Amino acid sequence: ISCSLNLTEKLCYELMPKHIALIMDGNRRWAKDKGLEVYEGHKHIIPKLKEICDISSKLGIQIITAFAFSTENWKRSKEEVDFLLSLFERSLKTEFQNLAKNNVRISIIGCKSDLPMTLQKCIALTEETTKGNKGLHLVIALNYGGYYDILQATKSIVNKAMNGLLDVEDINKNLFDQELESKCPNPDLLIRTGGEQRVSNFLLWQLAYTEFYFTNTLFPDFGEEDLKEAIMNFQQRHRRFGGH
Amino acid sequence: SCSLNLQTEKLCYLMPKHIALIMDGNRRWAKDKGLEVYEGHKHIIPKLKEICDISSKLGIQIITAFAFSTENWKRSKEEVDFLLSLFERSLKTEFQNLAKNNVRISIIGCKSDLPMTLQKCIALTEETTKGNKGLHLVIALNYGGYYDILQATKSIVNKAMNGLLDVEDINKNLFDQELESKCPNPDLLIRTGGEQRVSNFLLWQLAYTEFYFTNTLFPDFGEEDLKEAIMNFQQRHRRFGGHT
Ligand SMILES: CC(C)=CCC/C(C)=C/CSP(=O)(O)OP(=O)(O)O
Ligand SMILES: C=C(C)CCOP(=O)(O)OP(=O)(O)O
Ligand SMILES: C=C(C)CCOP(=O)(O)OP(=O)(O)O
Ligand SMILES: C=C(C)CCOP(=O)(O)OP(=O)(O)O
Ligand SMILES: [Mg+2]
Ligand SMILES: [Mg+2]
């Protein structure tokens, strides 16, 4: 198979970020620091995420993709996974009407069939109720990883080729983008709370020219002032996309 | 159909075994010092050799260095022609000594797009060093993350088309075996030049890599800067999605 790359590919990126990506990290250490019970940080996840949607919506931000549960988090104890998947279902039922009144559209990416059936039904109902809403699109990545996303797009392309729907030479960036679960437009800014300088198998393909913002602030402490700082910082960067 | 909660292992991550290196900021280093526009680029592969020598003594086994991306074709024909001729020159003048403790050199990227003379220089550099026993230097030249994932997808589609694999055999390990940069993946990414972004480097391979961004322009990056980056790496806690 031949290659040629000096022919051309448009990058689906942008004053203001259109799409923000969010790694919601540091919730355990936030509870350890305040001497609270082990899962009390995670109880702030969905409420804070609603606060961030509110602020971002007013600034003209159109998309937020938030990392809620990765495919490697299955490595944690049965007790933690069960507690936090139950907590996610509960919080999604508690803050739903707050998200719905702001005209937020809610989508979930990840492998849903591995989740508990009650959470699968709750997710399907949330997506149905909000699919027509016209405000900010909140995408929640739940049992998601970049490896998984690329693998399921590759399988989808293989099956199409098997059924006579495409040739090997039709496989390009545009086709791949439309087979991934996180699509164009790609994140302009990634904010990771919790102090770690790494991506932890989040949106690997989608982050090719994303601007990174790592903060030391633990996620339950990330408020309107911190989001405003991150956007102003983003506005101070020069994006060249390989050109001059 | 998908399932991800059973297979929670695989992957390939004191001292980082594999360092990834984005050699950025060469234009600004020549501008700041008032030199000719391409004077910084003449330092790229000499300094890269110096980094390999230091890295070899500390026990590092692999360096993957970004020398020319698939989006850099967007720059002026003058700059691109000058820089590809300069790479051909630098690649002949260094990486020549008969010492067996020197680096083994591979090139990843689409070589057929490059000037014929540079193609011949690359072939000669890979042949003369294939027996060397030191550090494996991989030079990423006309390379990008999209390109790497796309060519692996095309190779998998081809095999499936020709009866050589099943769609249900497609997993992380088979995909990894089709990429140009394979397991083991970089433990540490060092980007010189002030920008906090990845610019379509090793997208799949950087899933759990530790990021180290420095403002030092690449021609000023020496032994003290490398020792600082390794020290910073050693103070980091890698969890790979797990706990306790
Ligand atoms: C939904 C499940 C099972 C887990 C939560 C995943 C999550 C929110 C991770 C980021 S916060 P976490 O890694 O728990 O907290 P730190 O150890 O980083 O302080
Ligand atoms: C080939 C190298 C060293 C990496 C790309 O850096 P660029 O200078 O092309 O990256 P951007 O700032 O354009 O993102
Ligand atoms: C090898 C390549 C293409 C990048 C080197 O630095 P640049 O050419 O990007 O210079 P700056 O604009 O970053 O200073
Ligand atoms: C927010 C989510 C779902 C993942 C956060 O990163 P992790 O806490 O899993 O990442 P590592 O620090 O283990 O890389
Ligand atoms: Mg964490
Ligand atoms: Mg640059």
CATH code, domain with A64: 3.40.1180.10
Does the C-beta of A115 come closer than 6 Å to ligand 1? no
Answer yes or no: is A5 within a domain.
no
Q: Please give the distance, rounded to the nearest whole angstrom, from the Cα atom of residue A67 to the centre of ligand 1.
A: 10
Q: From the CB of residue B162, how many other CB atoms can be counted at a distance below 10 Å?
A: 8
Respond yes or no: is residue A25 known to be catalytic: yes
Does the C-beta of B25 come closer than 6 Å to ligand 3? yes
**Tokens at A195, concatenated:** 């102090």
Answer yes or no: is B117 within a domain.
yes
Ligand 4 pocket test, pick from B4, B210, B236, B239 with the greatest ligand atom count within 8 Å of Cβ, gives: B239
First-to-last CA distance in chain A? Answer: 32
In A, minimum Cα distance to B113 occurs at A4
Answer yes or no: is A12 within a domain.
no
CA-based radius of gyration for chain B: 19
- E strand or H helix that includes residue A149: helix A146-162
Answer yes or no: is B67 within a domain.
yes
Per CB-CB distance under 8 Å, the chain B contacts of A243 are 71-72, 74-75
Answer yes or no: is B76 within a domain.
yes
Phi, psi of B94 (to 5 degrees): -90, 180
The 8-class DSSP code of residue A19 comes to E
B167, A172: Cβ pair inside 8 Å?
Answer: no
- B4, exposed or middle or buried, with CB in 10 Å at 0-12, 13-18, 19+? buried
Q: Are B218 and B24 in contact (CB under 8 A)?
A: yes
Distance between CA atoms of residues A30 and A194, nearest Å: 9
Maximum Cα interatomic distance, chain A, rounded to a whole number of Å: 60
Query: How far is Cα of residue B142 from the mean position of the Cα atoms in its chain?
Result: 11
Alpha carbon of A125: minimum distance to chain B alpha carbons (Å): 20
Each residue of B38-55: b (16+ CB within 10 Å) or e?
bbbbbbbbebbebbbeeb
Question: What is the number of structural domains in chain A?
Answer: 1
Please enumerate in sequence order all residues whose Cβ is within 8 A of that of B121, keeping only pairs 6 or more positions apart, or say none. Answer: B88, B91, B92
Phi, psi of B65 (to 5 degrees): -115, 135
- At A194, is the secondary structure helix, strand, or coil? coil
The angle that helices B116-129 and B77-93 make with each other, rounded to 10 degrees, is 30
Answer yes or no: is A118 within a domain.
yes
Alpha carbon of A74: minimum distance to chain B alpha carbons (Å): 6
Residues of B marked as catalytic: 24
- At B143, is the secondary structure helix, strand, or coil? strand
In what side-by-side order are the strands of the sheet with B136-143? Answer: B104-108, B136-143, B62-69, B18-22, B188-191, B210-213
Of B44, B198, B221, nearest in space to A202 by CA: B198
**What was the structure determination method?**
X-ray
* Distances B3 to A112, A157, B227 between C-alpha atoms, Å: 9, 19, 42
Per CB-CB distance under 8 Å, the chain B contacts of A68 are none
Distance between CA atoms of residues A32 and A44, nearest Å: 14
Please enumerate in sequence order all residues whose Cβ is within 8 A of that of B234, keeping only pairs 6 or more positions apart, or say none. Answer: B14, B15
**Tokens at B190, concatenated:** 């060092």
Answer yes or no: is B9 within a domain.
no
Q: Are A163 and A189 in contact (CB under 8 A)?
A: no
The 8-class DSSP code of residue B110 comes to -
In what side-by-side order are the strands of the sheet with A189-192? Answer: A105-109, A137-144, A63-70, A19-23, A189-192, A211-214
Answer yes or no: is B176 within a domain.
no
Q: From the CB of residue B146, how many other CB atoms can be counted at a distance below 10 Å?
A: 20
The 8-class DSSP code of residue B194 comes to S
Range of the domain at A136: 25-35+44-71+82-145+190-233
Comparing CB atoms, the residue among B74, B175, B200 nearest residue A154 is B175
Distance between CA atoms of residues A122 and A57, nearest Å: 24
Distance between CA atoms of residues A50 and B150, nearest Å: 36
Distance between CA atoms of residues A102 and A134, nearest Å: 9
Per CB-CB distance under 8 Å, the chain A contacts of B157 are 157-158, 161, 168, 171
Of B240, B199, B153, B142, nearest in space to B20 by CA: B199
Please enumerate in sequence order all residues whose Cβ is within 8 A of that of B64, keeping only pairs 6 or more positions apart, or say none. Answer: B18, B19, B20, B21, B108, B138, B140, B181, B186, B202
Task: Outline where DSSP puts E strands in B54-173.
Answer: 62-69, 104-108, 136-143
